[PDB]
């Protein structure tokens with residue numbers, strides 16, 4: 001991977017990200033205990049994932065900038081901005097896991113379930129978000145793209161938070177209501193809640209760092225990348241239930257949780273009224289056999305075939321979008337991502 | 343009040359703040375349900391207080407700008423930025439009330455305790471914060487002070503969130519530990535958690551709107567205003583227990599809640615070891631008589647006299663600070679605030 005090549009250097013820069021977010025305030029003995037807590041919060045929640053989003057900033061910056069302008073300090077800013085994208089994500093997850101009452105995240109105890117944390121994790125989460133703008137100011141304050149990146153991350157938060165409201169409205173806990181689970185609503189939630197920050201954000205950020213700041217160039221990249229984000233999430237919903245779980249590690253609780261999955265959406269538009277009932281009675285419940293009987297209704301409806309059909313169509317749609325909207329960015333910016341996700 | 347004069351026009355602008363935060367997205371039928379939720383969140387949580395912080399932006403802008411540059415649109419931006427300060431506050435309180443497990447706020451049910459809200463209020467809170475930057479962009483994007491205000495509000499969040507961590511570390515729930523309750527720690531919590539956003543923020547914001555953007559001018563105003571914020575909070579802690587409660591409406595649960603109040607701090611530095619014990623045994627507990635016996639130990643120690651003594655010293659300290667650090671701002675900027683708080 002062009003990712004495994006830059007990965008080491010990405011994770012190693014984290015030590016410096018942290019030093020700087022705790023050292024810059026060495027003039028204030030008074031708040032040392034809060035800054036220690038902050039460190040623990042950064043270490044527990046920004047570390048442990050694959051870093052795909054943050055790393056995309058770095059890879060894209062390398063492909064976008066003329067190599068004579070990749071001086072040591074330019075790269076340091078790319079690593080730093082990649083970590084900003086990872087902290088934005090760590091803010092969202094720490095807060096989501098509290099809202100979902102999740103137990104674990106990456107098979108580790110969620111931060112809010114640790115002894116002594118509880119709902120204080122709400123402030124911790126907000127602190128992760130604040131670190132983003134601290135780092136931008138520390139590293140990028142003099143740069144012509146400074147304001148551009150501030151606005152991009154604030155817009156990234158807002159889109160995500162809007163998509164979270166939409167999700168929450170669409171799939172309450174303690175409420176089966178499949179009338180909400182439409183195709184338009186599904187695409188909407190995906191686009192606002194995950195595709196903007198997961199896919200648009202990191203390429204956009206490298207684009208601004210590269211001086212590529214035109215509205216049209218960004219609109220064009222966004223068209224391709226929101227489309228990829230849509231596919232990524234649909235594949236996430238398919239795997240949840242059909243992914244061989246040793247190939248994931250996770251085990252899908254989508255159905256138990258009344259999630260607006262891609263599966264239940266397709267299911268609903270493909271179902272005589274007797275089918276509705278079996279779903280209306282088994283969706284969003286805890287026991288194995290009532291969750292086995294939904295997996296059975298999906299298998300019975302060749303939704304795995306439907307997915308494979310969707311994955312094929314989607315891949316040629318994305319490639320046509322690259323052909324049509326990538327220029328004047330090197331198509332490889334988008335092709336590297338397409339390769340990771342297909 | 344110079345406040346009651348501009349108040350009406352402040353509260354009336356809220357209708358427009360909301361229209362604009364829900365109308366600007368009329369191109370996106372898809373997210374209408376999230377935007378309705380947002381409206382409800384704004385209406386329930388940004389309305390109902392006295393608006394002292396937001397109004398300070400407006401009053402200060404009027405005293406700082408030459409009146410030939412107070413065109414209709416300039417004022418609209420001042421009203422809007424005042425509402426930004428109120429939304430920053432509404433974000434903090436919605437989240438604090440969740441962390442504290444509070445029941446009511448302004449004698450109304452906290453937003454997170456409303457049926458159907460619960461911990462979704464965490465996203466709602468974050469949405470209040472995001473509205474700030476949406477409004478700044480909508481109203482102030484072309485202005486030379488734009489970036490200055492963005493940075494000021496992000497710094498205001500960060501300071502507050504840091505002070506919240508400090509508070510949370512200092513006064514856990516389920517932990518009497520008076521060893522943490524020192525004078526230095528109290529001043530620290532107050533300065534970071536409430537004085538920066540309550541007092542520095544709104545004057546600073548008007549200063550930038552006025553073109554007053556020098557680091558020295560801001561450092562000077564900050565010295566005066568963090569000092570006022572310290573006093574305001576100390577008076578808040580005194581009143582909690584001794585304020586005639588018809589003059590407040592509230593009724594102080596500081597002692598029950600193991601709060602790092604100004605009172606328990608003074609108490610501790612003024613106490614033989616037998617006194618420590620009575621406090622160590624009665625602080626942070628629920629029943630009336632164990633809370634009556636702390637109020638008794640305070641009265642017994644002439645802490646009300648101590649306060650009145652502190653209030654006198656404080657008022658001349660502030661006035662000397664105004665004399666010394668106000669220029670070239672009109673001293674009235676600071677004197678109006680001193681008048682509200684003393």
Ligand SMILES: Cc1ccc(-c2cc3c(NCP(=O)(O)O)ncnc3s2)cc1
Nearest residue numbers: 049050052053056198199202337340341
């Ligand atoms: C911008 C970007 C780039 C790549 C990804 C990927 C996530 C992921 C993945 N997800 C595991 P995860 O649930 O994201 O830890 N599994 C296998 N391949 C990939 S590629 C996500 C976002």
Ligand SMILES: Cc1ccc(-c2cc3c(NCP(=O)(O)O)ncnc3s2)cc1
Nearest residue numbers: 391392394395398540541544679682683
């Ligand atoms: C910038 C600024 C200006 C004024 C205030 C005041 C709050 C307040 C007050 N507080 C009642 P509150 O608990 O703030 O609703 N009560 C009486 N006078 C005042 S003045 C707080 C902040």
